[PDB]
């Protein structure tokens, strides 16, 4: 029989050393980890007048406060504690007049009944980018720009009537001074209906009036303030580390392959650094995996960033990858680490396409945090039933992960599993607790999803506020 | 959901070579009794015995039987041999299956 373990629920760190494990309750009790020095955050809105009025009504409505959804599960549906003296962010959001643009009906008609699926997206993105450029060059620049898409505009760039509108929008908006956030006209009022892509009989489904706000205002605060709301809780007596994430993506046409990396590491005070890179390392082959010199370059850039910030070198160079480590990749990584002079190192392949499952008796699945050591490999469950929520928030048997080291790591299994289970709840795009993937993979995927549409010879930035 | 297996003792190896996949297909249409637990690698038969009393001597041809225990076969740490061993286990799972049919072409199911 194999040896099993059950991991505890990880705790986060909010302001003034509050501990707690729920983002919503911790934000409502102690507030953000990094408090904003100002008092107001300015927001700019772009769209037709109906969307602007809906957005204004929405923020003035949610300023007073929204009650909860249900009574059977109090923790899973907490009420939003207003936006005022009892705000969870200890700040205010204020939409200033004059920092608001508009799009004429004739201009949208030009992006209406127009042929081809690449020209119309081009006209829409260049008009929106030019309007934002004209807004930014004045004296009413906001801290975050909200793009409220009309219902009609969706029928030409998203539904039916082929690139990604969001990808080209983010790629063209990379060269700005403030990040942007896109809404879909049904988050701001519960009276509109957007049809689906292939079948028009159904429609989109929205979470809740109280569930929208807990994510939207958190993301808006992060994008418009630049301060991290929460972070993982460091232990006592652990070594200094630096986490790197590797991923691969294919371009729009040609089915060649590329490589993306993410460069998390901790901070001296109370902070957390999470950023991408500043280059793309060619398109060497349409296969997966990576070459040797690219791995050398990635490791060198990561160590250069850590040396620039901390004025020293880290003691752990933890590496995660979505594919099996070939011999040349490991050779390059080991050569770079040995030339740099670091002693501790871990290389882990995270696998999702496995078939072994754990079955228990009863109407509810296995607890979140069960680990089974399969003769060197590790089966870890990051989804399932939780006692804090009081139920299992899913619809089927959850999907476990298989962790496997490349025979040269300096730490044993059931410690890498503990670190990966610790690293999953840090995601400032959602407030839930049922997230499966750790952040070094999701960050690289989100970076690549926008880096697909950057043309040759353009400039790119390491800012994470321009990829989410 | 794991399940252990226990492999048989003896393994039979032949040296027939003039039989591609097409030849063994067109000979398994007109084979009579159906056992369906052989593989083709080129110059080898690689089956679980029954070389004469199985209506398979048209490809066996009473070749020089290399009686080798399967205990050394599973220990053969080679990927190319491991894929063929898994192929033989998969094809032997296709026995005791005509009573329950299944396995159309793609879903790898046993309906």
């Amino acid at each position: 029989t194999f040896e099993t373990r059950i991991f505890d629920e990880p705790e986060l760190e909010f302001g003034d050393h509050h501990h707690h494990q729920d983002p919503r309750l911790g934000l409502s009790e102690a507030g953000p980890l990094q408090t904003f020095l100002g008092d107001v955050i300015k927001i700019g809105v772009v769209g037709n007048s109906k969307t602007i009025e809906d957005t204004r009504k929405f923020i003035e409505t949610v300023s007073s406060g929204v009650e909860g959804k249900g009574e059977k599960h109090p923790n899973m549906h907490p009420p939003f504690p207003g936006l005022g003296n009892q705000s969870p962010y200890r700040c205010r959001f204020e939409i200033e007049d004059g920092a608001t643009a508009a799009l004429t009906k004739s201009k949208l008609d030009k992006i209406g009944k127009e042929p081809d699926h690449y020209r119309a997206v081009e006209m829409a993105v260049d008009e929106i980018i030019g309007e934002l450029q004209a807004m930014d060059d004045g004296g009413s620049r906001p801290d975050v720009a909200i793009i409220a898409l009309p219902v009609k505009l969706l029928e030409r760039v998203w539904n039916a009537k082929a690139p990604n509108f969001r990808g080209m929008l983010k790629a063209k908006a990379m060269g700005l001074s403030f990040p942007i956030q896109i809404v879909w006209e049904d988050v701001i009022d519960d009276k509109v209906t957007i049809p689906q892509k292939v079948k028009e009989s159904s429609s989109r489904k929205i979470q809740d009036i109280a569930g929208r706000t807990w994510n939207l205002m958190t993301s808006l605060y992060y994008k418009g303030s630049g301060r991290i709301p929460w972070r993982r809780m460091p232990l006592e007596g652990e070594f200094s580390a630096c986490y790197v994430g590797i991923s691969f993506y294919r371009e729009a046409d040609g089915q060649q392959l590329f490589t993306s990396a993410a460069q998390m590491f901790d901070e001296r005070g109370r902070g957390f650094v999470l950023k991408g890179r500043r280059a793309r390392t060619e398109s060497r082959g349409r296969h997966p995996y990576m070459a040797r010199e690219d791995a050398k370059k990635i490791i060198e850039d990561v160590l250069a960033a850590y040396k620039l910030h901390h004025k020293t070198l880290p003691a752990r160079v933890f590496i995660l990858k979505t594919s099996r480590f070939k011999d040349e990749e490991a050779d390059g990584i080991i050569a770079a680490l040995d030339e740099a002079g670091t002693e501790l190192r871990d290389l882990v392949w995270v696998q999702e396409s496995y078939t072994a499952r754990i079955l228990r008796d009863g109407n509810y699945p296995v607890l979140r945090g069960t680990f089974v050591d399969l003769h060197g490999k590790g089966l870890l469950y990051t989804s399932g039933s939780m006692p804090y929520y009081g139920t299992y928030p899913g619809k089927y048997d959850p999907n476990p992960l298989l962790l496997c080291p490349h025979h040269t790591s300096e730490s044993t299994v059931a410690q890498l599993a503990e670190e990966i289970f610790s690293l999953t709840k840090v995601n400032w795009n959602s407030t839930q607790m049922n997230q499966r993937l750790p952040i070094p993979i999701r960050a690289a995927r989100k970076v690549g999803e926008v880096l697909k549409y950057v043309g040759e010879g353009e400039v790119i930035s390491a800012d994470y506020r321009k990829y989410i | 959901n794991m399940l252990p297996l226990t492999l048989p003792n003896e393994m039979y190896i032949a040296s027939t070579t003039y039989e591609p996949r097409k030849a063994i297909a067109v000979i398994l249409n007109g084979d009579g009794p159906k056992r369906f637990d052989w593989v083709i690698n080129g110059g080898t038969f690689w089956s679980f015995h029954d070389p004469r009393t199985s209506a398979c001597s048209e490809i066996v041809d009473i070749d020089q039987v290399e009686a080798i225990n399967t205990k050394e076969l599973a220990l053969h740490d080679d990927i190319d041999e491991q894929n063929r061993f898994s192929h033989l286990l998969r094809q032997t799972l296709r026995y005791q299956t005509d009573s329950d049919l299944g396995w159309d072409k793609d879903h790898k199911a046993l309906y």
């Binding site: 078939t355 072994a356 499952r357 079955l359 228990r360 008796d361 009863g362 109407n363 509810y364 699945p365 299992y392 619809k395 089927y396 048997d397 | 959901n1 794991m2 399940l3 252990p4 297996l5 492999l7 599973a74 286990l89 299944g102 879903h107 199911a109 309906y111």
Partner: protein, 52 residues
């Protein structure tokens, strides 16, 4: 110690032995209403199938 892994699933036919054109959405509809208790029972049923 060769190991076998079983993963329960469903196969749809129109009647007897014939493919169904609308075979894709029935799997999702059956998997959506399932619980986490039938899978273990199906697994031990398959084990009893193979052992007997």
């Amino acid at each position: 110690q060769w190991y076998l892994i079983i993963t329960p699933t469903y196969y749809y036919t129109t009647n007897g032995y014939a493919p169904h054109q609308f075979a894709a959405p029935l799997l999702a509809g059956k998997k959506r209403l399932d619980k986490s208790a039938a899978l273990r029972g199906q697994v031990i049923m398959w084990h009893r199938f193979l052992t007997q």
